[PDB]
């Protein structure tokens, strides 16, 4: 450590000799216990290649010795037959341009031999190489990749469609069906639960297992149980690592892997500011923003917090104001003072989850291009970002609600690698960094409800009057938290009526959003930034999945009551449930929203074209690609840019 500390702290000193640095690196790489340490130093040497312009072969040999083979391939041009041969050794089976880290190669060898593998930590190495290699060896047929977010599912679907385009058929949406022997099921926990064709699985890969170490714990546990009882091999790369036990006594002997391979060097500077002290945190943000000059990723606990941070960042003059057609589209479609709108007008990129997927992709590839400077992410895994960033500002660390902390000095390097920090990264931490019942309640309520109000629950096609109050009362009891988390109070049962009436009376999504913001300004007058975030979350999550789920749930419940009470009226909500799921579109078209086409663009697409009612995501995507000339002539420039980005169309 003493030699390591001397070499690390001599990096910024004026009297710096790179040869002594490489001597320290080699001395650290000789001792096994200091292996990682030497590797760390090499990473710094890879971020300061100007200082090592003279001793290049020594650095290359140290890179080979440390086991950083992708860095050996990509950061060095003049390669000897020795390092070329060892790169061919670790070359991945799926492509000739990707090689393996040493630890990645060991894990891949463990997996390709048929043994279940559990990793000890989400590591700075991207496990996408292992999954791509497992796909490329032509031995497995059916796979299930479990991902936490739908945007990550789309990113992985694009990744696995670029390569293995025809060999494997990728199922990501419930509309798709398995028509090929080889199928990759890139789904989330909820999607895995919904899919009823998960059988004969060869190997399912799960990352971000910390939920099992709530809406994300029960679903992941059920998905694990289903994939364990269905499949034969698994590869877990997340927490529940401290000598994982329990899967052994269930008949699944894994090969738990403990690793010490870190590919990222970090300079962590902490401030110790408590979360409650917001003004001190804001002054610290000013100081760091003055310090931060390169690509900065700011982690926040909420989109409102990110909006506040962006407003303060532009208050100090950080970032270059600019305008483009995209900012005009966002201003004319969402709002003028929305956090995303002002931040993008001033060069700040919000990337929260509730953001529309098209805008998420726009922010991601704006940050990747280097045009952005402050990307304010509210989640550890930012979908679409590459290894560009150089600074990570953890504005909020203690997220609360039993969450101990992110970046626990054992996760800082892994999470930094997930965020894609280029070799050396400065981690400015505001706080201190530490170390280490659904299908049966409704009928009971309906038992008390009398025959006089029973007429509001047996509909067919077109709804009837006074349905809004009954539905609001039902949803205020079935899912109180679902509506409460969006700023809609459970009681009195009137605001849900207003939301339902706004959704019903509206013809298009854009008009609904405009009316909602025009009412949100009045509501805050008794800000508009939080209103759009909660409204987007309400439409995407509540009005899309949960509320249709309960609308379908009450069907079979009310059938028995109608039979018992002698009501002979028909029971059918295909006009209402499908309309609410379809987002004022044809039933299947809304599925392109996850692909990355905005709903507002989809409305113009629906008006311009003729969409099949029974088609799936593949058929609609192929229909859009086939009829490109029809809509490209008479649609907005930003709309067709978003369509091209979402569908992968090249010009």
């Amino acid at each position: 450590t003493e030699i390591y500390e001397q070499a690390k702290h001599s990096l910024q000193g004026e009297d710096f000799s790179s040869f002594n640095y490489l001597f320290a690196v080699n001395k650290l790489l000789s001792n096994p216990v200091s292996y990682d340490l030497g590797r760390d130093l090499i990473v710094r040497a890879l971020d300061s290649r100007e200082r090592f312009s003279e001793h290049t072969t020594i650095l290359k040999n140290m890179v080979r010795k440390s086991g950083l083979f992708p860095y050996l391939k990509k950061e060095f041009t003049s390669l000897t037959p020795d390092d070329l041969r060892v790169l061919e050794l670790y070359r991945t089976p799926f492509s000739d341009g990707y090689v393996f880290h040493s630890m990645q190669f060991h894990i891949f060898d463990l997996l390709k031999s048929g043994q279940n593998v559990v990793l000890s930590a989400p590591t700075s190495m991207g496990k996408s190489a292992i999954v791509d290699s497992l796909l490329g060896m032509g031995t497995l047929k059916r796979l299930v990749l479990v991902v936490p977010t739908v945007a990550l599912a789309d990113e992985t679907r694009r990744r696995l469609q670029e390569r293995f385009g025809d060999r494997y058929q990728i199922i990501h949406h419930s509309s798709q069906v398995c028509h090929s022997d080889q199928a990759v099921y890139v789904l989330t926990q909820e999607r895995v639960n919904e899919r009823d064709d998960i059988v004969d699985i060869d190997l399912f890969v799960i990352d971000e297992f910390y939920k099992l170490a709530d809406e994300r714990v029960i679903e992941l546990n059920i998905a694990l149980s289903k994939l364990l009882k269905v499949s034969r091999q698994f590869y877990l790369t997340g927490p529940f690592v401290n000598s994982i036990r329990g899967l052994e006594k269930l008949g699944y002997p894994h090969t738990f892997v403990s690793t010490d391979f870190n590919t990222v060097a970090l300079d962590v500077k902490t401030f110790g500011i408590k979360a409650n002290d917001d003004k001190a945190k804001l002054k610290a943000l000013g100081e760091i923003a003055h310090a931060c000059v390169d690509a900065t990723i700011i982690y926040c606990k909420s989109p409102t917090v990110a909006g506040l941070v962006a407003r303060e960042l532009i208050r100090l003059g950080h970032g270059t104001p600019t305008e483009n057609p995209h900012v005009d589209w966002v201003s004319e479609e969402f709002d003028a003072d929305w956090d995303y709108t002002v931040a993008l007008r001033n060069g700040i990129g919000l990337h929260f989850g509730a953001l529309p997927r098209a805008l998420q992709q726009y922010t991601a590839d704006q940050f990747n291009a280097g045009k952005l400077r402050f990307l304010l992410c509210t989640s550890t895994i930012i979908e679409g970002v590459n290894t560009i960033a150089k600074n990570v500002v953890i504005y909020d660390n203690r997220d609360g609600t039993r969450s101990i902390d992110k970046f626990t000095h054992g996760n800082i390097k892994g999470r930094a690698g997930r965020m894609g920090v280029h070799f050396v990264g400065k981690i400015f931490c505001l706080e201190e960094i530490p170390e280490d019942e659904q299908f049966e309640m409704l009928q009971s309520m309906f038992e008390m409800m009398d025959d006089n109000e029973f007429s509001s629950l047996v509909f067919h096609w077109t709804p009837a009057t006074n349905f809004l109050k009954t539905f609001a009362k039902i949803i205020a009891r079935l899912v109180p938290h679902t509506f409460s988390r969006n700023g809609v109070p459970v009681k009195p049962t009137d605001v849900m009526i207003a939301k339902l009436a706004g959704y019903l009376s509206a013809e298009s999504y854009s008009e609904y959003l405009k009316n909602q913001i025009d009412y949100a300004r009045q509501w805050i007058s008794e800000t508009l930034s939080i209103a759009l975030n909660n409204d987007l979350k309400l439409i995407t999550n509540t009005f899309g999945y949960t509320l249709p789920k309960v609308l379908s749930l009450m069907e079979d419940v009310v059938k028995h009551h109608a039979v018992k009470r002698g009501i002979r009226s028909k029971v059918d909500y295909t006009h209402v449930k499908l309309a609410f799921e379809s987002f004022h579109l044809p039933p299947g078209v809304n599925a392109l929203e996850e692909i990355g086409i905005p709903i507002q663009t989809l409305h113009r697409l629906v008006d311009l074209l003729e969409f099949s009612d029974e088609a799936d995501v593949d058929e609609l995507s192929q229909y859009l690609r086939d009829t490109q000339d029809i809509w490209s002539r008479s649609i907005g420039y930003v709309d067709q840019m978003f369509i091209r980005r979402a569908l992968g169309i090249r010009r």
Binding site: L89, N242, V257
Partner: protein, 531 residues
Amino acid sequence: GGVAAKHGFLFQDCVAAYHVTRMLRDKTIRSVRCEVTDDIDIVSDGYIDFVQVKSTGKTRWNISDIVQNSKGADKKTIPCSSILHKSMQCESDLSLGRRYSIVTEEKVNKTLEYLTISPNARLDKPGRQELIDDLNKRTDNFLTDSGISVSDWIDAATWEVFSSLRELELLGIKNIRLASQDLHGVILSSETVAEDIWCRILDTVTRKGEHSRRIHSADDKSYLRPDLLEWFKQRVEDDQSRSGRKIYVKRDLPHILTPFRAPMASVCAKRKGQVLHQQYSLKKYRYKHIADNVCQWLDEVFLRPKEMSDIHKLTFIEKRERLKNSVFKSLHDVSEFLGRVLLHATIRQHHESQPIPCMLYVEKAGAEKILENVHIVRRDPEGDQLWIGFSELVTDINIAVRLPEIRDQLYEDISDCIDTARKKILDIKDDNYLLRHDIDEILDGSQPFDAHLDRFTFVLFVGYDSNLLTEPETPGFEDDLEKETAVLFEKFAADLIEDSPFANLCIHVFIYPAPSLERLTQLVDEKVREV
């Protein structure tokens, strides 16, 4: 508590087991002496750590307990026999840096809280002076027989607190798993194997088992690193056998060209020469035999053992269908490989014990200079000589005028090797060789060579197309060739007799005559394309 609680062990046993696992991973640790489980005596390269395991039971570790004088007698108290007193009264015959450590399960009071932080981070933190004077007052200014003051004990004291037994078990098992991974390239099959190795180490430390399943000790109370390494290797190969995998064993590499007749050298014995002819096979030269013997040296010369075991981890089909393209791009890239393979195998054949292949990096007016084909030989009665190897395959001019040029270039390289005060980097490339101070003193360059020219020797391989050797066998391709190579070796005498430019350096020559090196190079190029 984890598996130690199931087996019924105490905290001191797990501390000793954790320290021997540290020795398993730490290359600088030389031994772990353990008479009792609470008096560990870890001897490291340049240091000696006395680790004492203690425990109260009331609430914490106050200062009074650490200065409390142990009873240790029949209703009497021996003077100057406290925990602190026993800590400083820890003699060591070797002149090694003394370090003290107290390991307790219970936490530490505010008075002793200064001890918890590592000494590397005590430059600006408070808690030093008042603690020192309080200890001196309570101990009446104790100076030991070796002149060790309480302040001296303070500057070297790293009191560690472990929350529970299971935490220590987890660090030990992680050490075992990582040690397996970076010492054998093998991931343990399950957690049960790691727990079994931990239990066996605990049994060894506490001597509560059976001798066969125990780390060997030449004398009791002490465990050396090589014994633990061999025991751990046996355990890892046991894992590999019971897991269905196949144990990696280095192949008996083919013996490339056999030596000539009895070695010929100079009077002063600082110049050596050994020819390496190859015999014919029924009137015809064995070019194919030489080439397909050389191409077996594709992994010993290019790769490293840590990544050579990964080659074994590849099944047959991947090994076939991964290296299909040729890693060589030119004939001037195959000639270098062959010329260095011949020397890399000649050095191994010439030495009864296998030398350690390594590389050397040296500066030259601020620019890097790489030296491949370096070796470490193990001459126990004398030390550890470093052989620096240079290859050459002359095929353009005759060897008679080329050899002095090669010697001049060799002398320039030598003057850029053993004539400097700046450090040199030695890439050991064996992962299992412990570099002793005999070579490390030369590497650091802090001291001028004190007759260090015996430690460094330079070996040069010179293959050439001899006139005598032709495609026809020409019965009697000897006698004349013996005097021919004698005259060739005489070139490594003119500077020796006339002057002393570097006449005190032992220099080895490995001249090899062939009918045509170009044909051999073409044959090797053809053969490597087959794999």
